[PDB]
Design an enzyme around this catalytic site. Structure first.
Site, PDB file in Angstrom:
ATOM      1  N   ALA B 424       0.822  -1.204   0.000  1.00 27.08           N
ATOM      2  CA  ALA B 424       0.000   0.000   0.000  1.00 27.08           C
ATOM      3  C   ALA B 424       0.859   1.257   0.000  1.00 27.08           C
ATOM      4  O   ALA B 424       0.692   2.139  -0.854  1.00 27.08           O
ATOM      5  CB  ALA B 424      -0.934  -0.009   1.207  1.00 27.08           C
ATOM      6  N   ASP B 450       9.238  -6.730  -5.523  1.00 30.13           N
ATOM      7  CA  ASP B 450       8.274  -7.328  -4.609  1.00 30.13           C
ATOM      8  C   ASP B 450       7.926  -8.733  -5.078  1.00 30.13           C
ATOM      9  O   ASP B 450       7.613  -8.933  -6.255  1.00 30.13           O
ATOM     10  CB  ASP B 450       7.020  -6.475  -4.503  1.00 30.13           C
ATOM     11  N   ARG B 461      -7.191  -1.306   0.071  1.00 29.71           N
ATOM     12  CA  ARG B 461      -6.238  -0.255   0.412  1.00 29.71           C
ATOM     13  C   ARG B 461      -5.170  -0.033  -0.652  1.00 29.71           C
ATOM     14  O   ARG B 461      -4.295   0.813  -0.456  1.00 29.71           O
ATOM     15  CB  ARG B 461      -5.572  -0.549   1.760  1.00 29.71           C
ATOM     16  N   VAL B 500      14.297  -9.169  -1.197  1.00 24.11           N
ATOM     17  CA  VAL B 500      15.534  -8.510  -0.790  1.00 24.11           C
ATOM     18  C   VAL B 500      16.036  -9.217   0.461  1.00 24.11           C
ATOM     19  O   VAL B 500      15.474  -9.056   1.546  1.00 24.11           O
ATOM     20  CB  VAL B 500      15.324  -7.015  -0.536  1.00 24.11           C
ATOM     21  N   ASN B 525       8.044  -6.010   7.812  1.00 25.26           N
ATOM     22  CA  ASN B 525       8.742  -6.800   8.812  1.00 25.26           C
ATOM     23  C   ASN B 525      10.052  -6.110   9.153  1.00 25.26           C
ATOM     24  O   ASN B 525      10.607  -5.356   8.353  1.00 25.26           O
ATOM     25  CB  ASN B 525       9.003  -8.228   8.324  1.00 25.26           C
ATOM     26  N   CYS B 580       6.116 -22.719  30.506  1.00 27.85           N
ATOM     27  CA  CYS B 580       5.272 -23.363  31.505  1.00 27.85           C
ATOM     28  C   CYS B 580       3.844 -22.847  31.429  1.00 27.85           C
ATOM     29  O   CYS B 580       2.891 -23.629  31.494  1.00 27.85           O
ATOM     30  CB  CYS B 580       5.846 -23.146  32.904  1.00 27.85           C
TER      31      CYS B 580
HETATM   32  P1  LIG Z   1       1.896  -4.659   3.487  1.00 28.25           P
HETATM   33  O1  LIG Z   1       2.381  -5.652   4.514  1.00 28.25           O
HETATM   34  O2  LIG Z   1       0.508  -4.966   2.991  1.00 28.25           O
HETATM   35  O3  LIG Z   1       2.900  -4.706   2.254  1.00 28.25           O
HETATM   36  C1  LIG Z   1       4.182  -5.271   2.500  1.00 28.25           C
HETATM   37  C2  LIG Z   1       4.899  -5.427   1.187  1.00 28.25           C
HETATM   38  O4  LIG Z   1       6.316  -5.613   1.439  1.00 28.25           O
HETATM   39  C3  LIG Z   1       6.791  -6.680   0.655  1.00 28.25           C
HETATM   40  N1  LIG Z   1       7.925  -7.307   1.331  1.00 28.25           N
HETATM   41  C4  LIG Z   1       7.934  -7.811   2.575  1.00 28.25           C
HETATM   42  N2  LIG Z   1       9.152  -8.337   2.864  1.00 28.25           N
HETATM   43  C5  LIG Z   1       9.932  -8.178   1.785  1.00 28.25           C
HETATM   44  C6  LIG Z   1      11.319  -8.503   1.416  1.00 28.25           C
HETATM   45  N3  LIG Z   1      12.150  -9.124   2.283  1.00 28.25           N
HETATM   46  N4  LIG Z   1      11.735  -8.162   0.183  1.00 28.25           N
HETATM   47  C7  LIG Z   1      10.933  -7.546  -0.696  1.00 28.25           C
HETATM   48  N5  LIG Z   1       9.663  -7.224  -0.422  1.00 28.25           N
HETATM   49  C8  LIG Z   1       9.115  -7.509   0.776  1.00 28.25           C
HETATM   50  C9  LIG Z   1       5.606  -7.610   0.466  1.00 28.25           C
HETATM   51  O5  LIG Z   1       5.783  -8.448  -0.652  1.00 28.25           O
HETATM   52  C10 LIG Z   1       4.446  -6.626   0.348  1.00 28.25           C
HETATM   53  O6  LIG Z   1       4.280  -6.246  -1.013  1.00 28.25           O
END
Ligand SMILES: *P(=O)(O)OC[C@H]1O[C@@H](n2cnc3c(N)ncnc32)[C@H](O)[C@@H]1O
Lengths: 76, 985, 147, 75
Positions: B424, B450, B461, B500, B525, B580
């Site tokens: 988004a 991506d 969104r 990546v 993340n 636990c």
């Molecule tokens: P929102 O969580 O909806 O979008 C997150 C986008 O980030 C891309 N994504 C997450 N982690 C990575 C890595 N390690 N490399 C390239 N792109 C990443 C997801 O694919 C979502 O498009």
């Protein structure tokens, strides 16, 4: 001297500190009242991000001053 | 009846009642320029009942500066007519109409009225009517790098939820006679003065369980006071308290009244004297426009600025404002009157759309009432800004040129950015770049990466993806959409499908990273954020981080040699419960969900993976006997899932599901209660199952019960999916097959030189030889959201609810279980728009190459309470090495590919340091405490050869450098911290 | 994390733990094999227990994974070697060295906590029949923790 | 009389005390000698924890008895 800290969620915290207290003491008080370790606290006053090792008088923080306690987010 | 497949993320933020109210509200939008179209887009994605547009002005070319639904072929057509066609596609449940003429009474059909690009007289005329008829009125203006928002929701607005947080709850330890409530050991209630709470499950004071809220007086982080409970009892023990959120009455003032004595909202406390200036400035702008037939001041014209300042003085004198006008700032507003930026448009559109949703749903605390914002620090200073260079050139970038100039436009047009992630925030950023004209020059380029694919819950969104685009790659769709928006980008965008990470350094290598100008993250993340940050630090490239969570958001900027990197600061970690607590004594729904997730992993993916790996590894058992802590469990798993319990039909699968139900919900509880009976006491004489420990109860299977039947069906379907059988969902077969099962008897057991080893060896050799089965594999169950509709969420929900009924915990439905187990991040369109706007506002600072640390602004904001904060970035720390100032983050040693002995002598001779530890990657190349023989063997080898020898893996052909971490101590023995080394292969 | 790991290793080297000796495996820094001696006034007397330590990539921002390798008959340690310690799950802070963890584990061996156990059977045995627990612990430690 | 206290690090500290001495006095001596705050000390003798306000004789501590000083932890 008494100061207020506003979190990013609207909660208000009242702290009793002196102008010669170090930032570490303020972070310790915030940890006591909130449980957030000092290394995870981001305090903002008048557009300046408070850093460890300095005193409040450096930032001209006086009584009834407002600090903002903020944090980073991981969504995307 | 809300579409949970599309509003999945927005439901975690608003709710069901909020969206039910939202789908019954009508919104009118006056003005269809960039700000208006952004507001309409955000509202349509939000899900209001309908949107009506009114803007009969014919299209002009400069309007394309921020309007991304207009093209060069629409010149001369009314903006509403050409925008409605594109707006209708964003959401199919939100009809969009057009009205060619407005009348006062006609305004009575709409719940909210948004006004943009309108003179002050019309705003007063409309508001004088909408105020007395109780219709929310929002007015927004965007002039260059300045923005204004005004909200008026009526005389008696009622706000149900103020802060938007979830109600607080906790467990009590003792309630005294005077209302002194104490929390448990090391637990914080988190309440605040003036809150209301209700109690349940209180023993000794039954009256408190009625549910009447009581005032809270916080006396400490662990205890508080509620009042006098003398009559209700003497003392109470245990129980749970829960917060109650009460409605509030907010009273607004009409626009005519408000102009005299406004009530401001300060987006930044660093400049508290400005909003009073902007209040005069915008009124002066409106008056001047009324004095020139609606013609705004020409860009960077001084005569018009003087006339505008005279209007400002006249207005200030008229309103008896005892404020000294800052001439520079007001004339700056005058110069940028005709500016029209897409970043400011996005920011204000997100904010105003959130205000519209507040008006329709009566949630969150609205702005009260004026919100004046500016990002004047973004004005370039390294280029020529004057009337000559800011005059319109008759192109679609006139709006941006009117603020920055032609030279800065050329600077922007030759950027080479790199966008990581296309979700988004990525889509919003790409739209902003396309509108700004990024990389449209002869040396420009954009790279998007991506690895995911479009789903059905992402359309809401993400406005660049249509239902016809389901299943394609995100990057390709985004690139095509932005090329359609701005035809000049055809061929300037390159899209990859590479995650990546450490396994993709062959593509995003030195050649790729040397040509970039900046990197922008749109990830979800922290691991990927940290990795990209390390890469940017190594290659010294500016980085733009941004994140959202529901209605909260933040943006940060990393500049080489100026500020600290992303990883220099810490964030709160994810909560992990003690093992636990999870395994035996849960007292919350999250505990049971985590337990169910662990059970799923260990029952459908761990055994299958173990079996598959055993059949391929010829020496697995040899290493397993000495390596694994409990090889017996592995052997039993292999046996059970290979030979003992190989199914062929579905009836035996259902029998297996019933057996597992008995194992995990009836027998373990009996064993636990045998070890710790319900009347057992602790070593201090206190009751055992009191407080954090809840006494369990065995569950007896009942086919008619919905929960048990759901679990049986889910488990059977998952097992069939594991073994590739033809699953069924007809209840008749389940009823037929479950009735013929007689559980084997179960009775709790009380417990009570190398024989065990020989037994384990005998069990091992009893297994079939590896050559018996070749090419046989079984499919472990992976986790997703209805993409692999193996009842994953349903199975987890059923397991968690059954275990909750085991411990008398309140069960959670499938929605909350999906939220918790899936670790879904709540998402909102408005937050995405706002963060994209802030990032694009920082981008122009990065392009201009500003060097002072006071000119950048990390931004934080929360839209539920209308809070905005901006702070200067943290400067990178300095240090003293060999009596010289060294940056601790952005400095490195550049050395050739020399021998280890040569490197040690080089550090001993130039820096006067003794090397003690030297490591690269995850390997310890050299340490001072190693035996002399090993070192003498490893000294005359070059660094590349040494790494190859230690890692037992040849360096890849594309590797062009190595990063070494070195810890060395001074001559006196004091440890010295030094930057990393960059060996050039 | 490499610098932090090496600092902890050197700190261990400078001051011997006496009752413990932790070090890497092979030439890998993200995998340690620690050793502990049972307390003298405990059923585990005369035993040597091996522990596996796996440092996460985010160390010290994520707690190390510490698992017993030998077989020990203790209320707070299950058959997989998992240890019931608050400082490994949610009380971990980026200021605790591995030496603190080893001292905590030795203290845990000194006195089990049957009030909040991890293995209910052994906890019940400890609460009911102390002598049988003592005999079982001695036999287990002399059959698995010697050699 | 004399007693010995062994820490978690294997160190043995010999102390000259009396059976009538209170546990608070022992904790004060330990804090003086080692700097360990009293709150974090857990003294065990013959499987029993020494408590403040009591004496060594209450635990039948005798000539050259050995105690163990460990840390506090619950969970
Ligand atoms: P929102 O969580 O909806 O979008 C997150 C986008 O980030 C891309 N994504 C997450 N982690 C990575 C890595 N390690 N490399 C390239 N792109 C990443 C997801 O694919 C979502 O498009």
């Amino acid at each position: 001297m008494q100061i207020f800290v506003k979190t990013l969620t609207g909660k208000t915290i009242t702290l009793e500190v002196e102008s010669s207290d170090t930032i570490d003491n303020v972070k310790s008080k915030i940890q006591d009242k909130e449980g957030i370790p000092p290394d995870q606290q981001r305090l903002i006053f008048a557009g300046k991000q408070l850093e460890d090792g300095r005193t409040l008088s450096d930032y001209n923080i006086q009584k009834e001053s407002t600090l903002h306690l903020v944090l980073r987010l991981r969504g995307g | 009846t809300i579409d949970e497949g599309l509003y999945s993320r927005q439901l975690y933020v608003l709710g069901h009642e909020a969206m039910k109210q939202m789908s019954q509200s009508n919104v009118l939008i006056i003005g269809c320029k960039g700000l208006g179209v952004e507001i309409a887009k955000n509202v349509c994605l939000a899900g209001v009942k309908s949107v009506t547009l009114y803007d009969p002005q014919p299209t002009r070319i400069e309007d394309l500066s921020s309007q991304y639904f207009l093209t060069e072929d629409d010149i001369g057509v009314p903006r509403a007519k050409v925008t409605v066609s594109k707006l209708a596609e964003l959401n199919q449940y939100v009809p969009v109409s057009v009205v060619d003429e407005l009348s006062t009474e006609y305004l009575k059909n709409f719940k909210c009225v948004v006004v943009t690009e309108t003179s002050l007289t019309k705003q007063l005329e409309i508001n004088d009517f909408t105020h007395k008829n109780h219709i929310a009125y929002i007015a927004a203006d965007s002039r260059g790098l300045f923005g204004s928002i005004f909200c008026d929701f009526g005389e008696n607005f009622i706000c149900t939820d103020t802060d938007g947080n979830e109600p607080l709850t906790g467990m009590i330890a003792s309630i005294t006679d005077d209302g002194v409530v104490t929390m448990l050991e090391e637990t914080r209630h988190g309440l605040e003065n003036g809150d209301f709470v209700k109690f349940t499950e209180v023993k000794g004071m039954p009256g408190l369980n009625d549910g009447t809220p009581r005032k809270v007086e916080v006396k400490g982080p662990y205890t508080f006071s509620i009042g006098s409970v003398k009559d209700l009892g003497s003392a109470g023990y245990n129980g749970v308290f829960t917060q109650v959120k009460v409605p509030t009455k907010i009273s607004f003032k009409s626009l005519r009244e408000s102009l005299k004595d406004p009530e401001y909202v300060y987006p930044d406390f660093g400049k508290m004297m400005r909003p009073p200036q902007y209040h005069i400035a915008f009124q002066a702008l409106s008056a001047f426009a009324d004095a020139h037939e609606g013609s705004l001041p020409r860009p960077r014209n001084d005569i018009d600025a003087a006339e505008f300042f005279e209007f400002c003085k006249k207005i200030a004198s008229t309103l008896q404002f005892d404020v000294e006008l800052d001439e520079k700032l007001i004339k700056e507003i005058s110069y940028q009157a005709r500016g029209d930026l897409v970043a400011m448009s996005a920011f204000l559109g997100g904010a105003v759309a959130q205000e519209v949703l507040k008006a329709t749903t009566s949630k969150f605390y609205p702005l009260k009432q004026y919100f004046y914002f500016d990002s004047l620090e973004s004005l370039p200073s390294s280029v020529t800004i004057s009337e000559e260079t800011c005059k319109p050139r008759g192109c679609r970038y006139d709006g941006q040129i009117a603020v920055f100039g032609s030279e800065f436009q050329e600077k922007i047009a030759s950027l080479s950015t790199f966008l990581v992630g296309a979700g988004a925030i990525g889509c919003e950023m790409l739209k902003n770049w396309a509108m700004m004209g990024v990389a449209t020059g002869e040396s420009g380029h954009i790279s998007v990466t991506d690895m995911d694919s479009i789903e059905k819950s992402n359309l809401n969104r993400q406005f660049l993806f249509r239902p016809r685009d389901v299943g394609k790659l995100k990057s390709e769709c985004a690139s095509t959409a932005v090329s359609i928006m701005n035809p000049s980008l055809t061929g300037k965008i390159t899209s990859y499908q590479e995650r990546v990470g450490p396994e993709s350094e062959g593509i995003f290598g030195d050649e790729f990273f040397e040509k970039l100008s900046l990197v922008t993250n749109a990830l979800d993340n922290v691991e990927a954020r940290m990795y990209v940050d390390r890469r940017c630090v190594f290659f010294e490239k500016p980085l733009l981080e941004s994140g959202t969570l529901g209605t909260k958001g933040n943006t940060q900027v990393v500049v080489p040699h100026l500020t600290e990197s992303y990883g220099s600061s810490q964030d709160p970690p994810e909560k992990s419960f003690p093992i636990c607590t999870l395994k035996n004594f849960p007292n919350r729904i999250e505990h049971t969900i985590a337990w169910a997730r662990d059970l799923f992993e260990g029952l459908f993916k761990q055994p299958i993976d173990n079996v598959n790996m055993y059949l391929s590894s010829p020496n697995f058992l040899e290493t397993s006997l000495k390596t694994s802590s409990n090889p017996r469990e592995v052997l039993e798993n292999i046996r059970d899932y290979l030979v003992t319990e190989k199914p062929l039909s579905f009836e035996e699968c259902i029998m297996w599901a019933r057996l597992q139900f008995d194992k995990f919900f009836n027998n373990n509880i009996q064993q636990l209660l045998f070890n710790f009976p319900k009347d057992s006491v602790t070593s201090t004489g206190q009751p055992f199952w009191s407080g954090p420990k809840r006494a369990p109860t065995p569950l007896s299977f009942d086919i008619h019960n919905r929960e048990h039947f759901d679990f049986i069906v889910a488990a059977a379907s998952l097992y069939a999916f594991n073994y590739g059988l033809k699953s069924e969902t007809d209840p008749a077969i389940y009823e037929r097959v479950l009735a013929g099962y007689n559980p084997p008897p179960f009775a709790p057991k009380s417990g009570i030189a190398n024989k065990d080893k020989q037994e384990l060896k005998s069990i091992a050799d009893s297994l079939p030889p590896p050559s018996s089965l070749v090419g046989f594999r079984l499919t472990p169950a992976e986790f997703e959201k209805d993409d692999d509709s193996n009842h994953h969420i349903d199975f987890i929900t059923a397991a968690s609810n059954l275990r909750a009924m085991n411990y008398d915990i309140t069960p959670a439905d499938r929605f909350k279980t999906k939220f918790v187990a899936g670790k879904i991040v709540p998402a909102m369109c408005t937050s995405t728009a706002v963060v994209s706007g802030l990032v694009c506002l920082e981008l122009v600072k990065l392009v201009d190459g500003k060097k002072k640390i006071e000119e950048y602004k990390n931004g934080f904001f929360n839209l539920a309470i209308g809070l905005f904060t901006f702070s200067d970035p943290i400067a990178s720390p300095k240090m003293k090495v060999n009596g010289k100032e060294i940056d601790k983050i952005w400095d490195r040693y550049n050395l050739p590919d020399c021998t280890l002995q040569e490197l040690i002598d080089y550090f001993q001779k130039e820096e006067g340091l003794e090397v003690t530890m030297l490591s690269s990657g995850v390997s310890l190349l050299y340490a001072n405490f190693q035996p002399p023989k090993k070192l003498a063997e490893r000294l005359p080898l070059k660094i590349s050869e040494l790494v190859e020898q230690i890692t037992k893996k040849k360096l890849e052909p594309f590797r062009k450098h190595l990063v070494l971490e070195i810890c060395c101590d001074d001559a006196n023995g004091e440890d010295v911290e030094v930057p990393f080394i960059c060996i050039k292969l | 994390a490499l610098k932090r790991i090496n600092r902890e290793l050197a700190d261990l080297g400078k001051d011997p733990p006496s009752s413990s000796s932790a070090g890497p495996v092979g030439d890998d820094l993200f995998h340690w094999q620690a050793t502990i001696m049972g307390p003298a006034d405990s059923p585990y007397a005369g035993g040597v227990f091996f522990l596996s330590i796996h440092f996460p990539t985010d160390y010290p921002f994520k707690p190390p994974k510490v698992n017993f390798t030998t077989r020990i008959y203790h209320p707070n340690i299950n058959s997989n070697g998992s240890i019931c310690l608050d400082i490994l799950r949610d009380q971990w802070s980026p200021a605790l060295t591995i030496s603190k963890v080893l001292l905590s584990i030795s203290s845990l061996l000194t006195d089990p906590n049957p009030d909040d156990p991890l293995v209910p059977e052994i906890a019940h045995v400890y609460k009911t029949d102390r002598s049988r627990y003592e005999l079982s612990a001695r036999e287990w430690t002399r059959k698995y923790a010697i050699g």
